[PDB]
Amino acid sequence: YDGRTGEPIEGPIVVGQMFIMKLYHMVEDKMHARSTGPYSLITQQPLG
Amino acid sequence: EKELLEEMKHPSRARRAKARKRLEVVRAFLDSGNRPEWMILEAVPVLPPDLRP
Amino acid sequence: KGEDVPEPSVPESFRVLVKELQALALDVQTLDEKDNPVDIFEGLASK
DNA sequence: GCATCCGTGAGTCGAGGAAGCACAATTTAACACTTTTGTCAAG
DNA sequence: CTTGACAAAAGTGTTAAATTGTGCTATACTGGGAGCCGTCACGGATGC
């Protein structure tokens, strides 16, 4: 059944129990933004 | 250049091929105004210290 | 200050390249429409 | 003509940061003193 | 606006440490040491 409407899905669905893992790649560790910051010595370009 | 140009009329293709290569280098110095002896360094430039910090 | 960004200038990377080409004994010179030299170092390197 | 050699090229972000001493010569530090400078109250 | 005490605030001048540069050793000594090694493309140049 559809939880929003209460009407059934028009076709039978494959429902079961599956083992799923939470991997080490998390958006918390990867989101990064910068306006201004440190610059390099010789080229004076932003660090990476 | 005058000697090289004269050798540019040699019947052999290798002789003219070699003469053209020599004269292309000779022409480059003649046109640009550089001196061949400038390819040997008497004074070595030193890079500014901030580019080699 | 609430203003529009100004026009850019010569990057510092190109100035580093010119000094590195000079460190190789190569005379790299930026010219103008009339072939006259144009100083991109603000006179800071002209003796 | 042909092999054989050398030289240049081979994807992009990201994350991972063992002499030793002597001595002379030069420099640095610590006094000393005088010479500004900054305040003061006046006046 | 000055006008004279004042006091650090600073500078100039020696002096002595502390640091730094330099020369010198007298048995005889006489030509180095580390790679070693699985890729494939091309030009382009020479050995002729």
Curated annotation (Swiss-Prot), chain A:
Note the subunit structure: The RNAP catalytic core consists of 2 alpha, 1 beta, 1 beta' and 1 omega subunit. When a sigma factor is associated with the core the holoenzyme is formed, which can initiate transcription.
Question: Would you identify the family this protein belongs to, as annotated?
Answer: Belongs to the RNA polymerase beta chain family.
Known role: DNA-dependent RNA polymerase catalyzes the transcription of DNA into RNA using the four ribonucleoside triphosphates as substrates.
Protein name from the UniProt record? DNA-directed RNA polymerase subunit beta
Whole protein: which stretch is covered? 975 to 1022 of 1119
UniProtKB/Swiss-Prot annotation, chain B:
Disulfide bridge map: none
**Cleaved signal peptide residues:** none
Domain of life, per UniProt, equals Bacteria
Quaternary organization: The RNAP catalytic core consists of 2 alpha, 1 beta, 1 beta' and 1 omega subunit. When a sigma factor is associated with the core the holoenzyme is formed, which can initiate transcription.
Any idea what job this protein has?
A: DNA-dependent RNA polymerase catalyzes the transcription of DNA into RNA using the four ribonucleoside triphosphates as substrates.
Family per similarity comment: Belongs to the RNA polymerase beta' chain family.
Q: What is this protein called?
A: DNA-directed RNA polymerase subunit beta'
Q: What is the lineage of its organism?
A: Bacteria, Thermotogati, Deinococcota, Deinococci, Thermales
Q: Which residues of the full protein are shown?
A: 474 to 526 of 1524
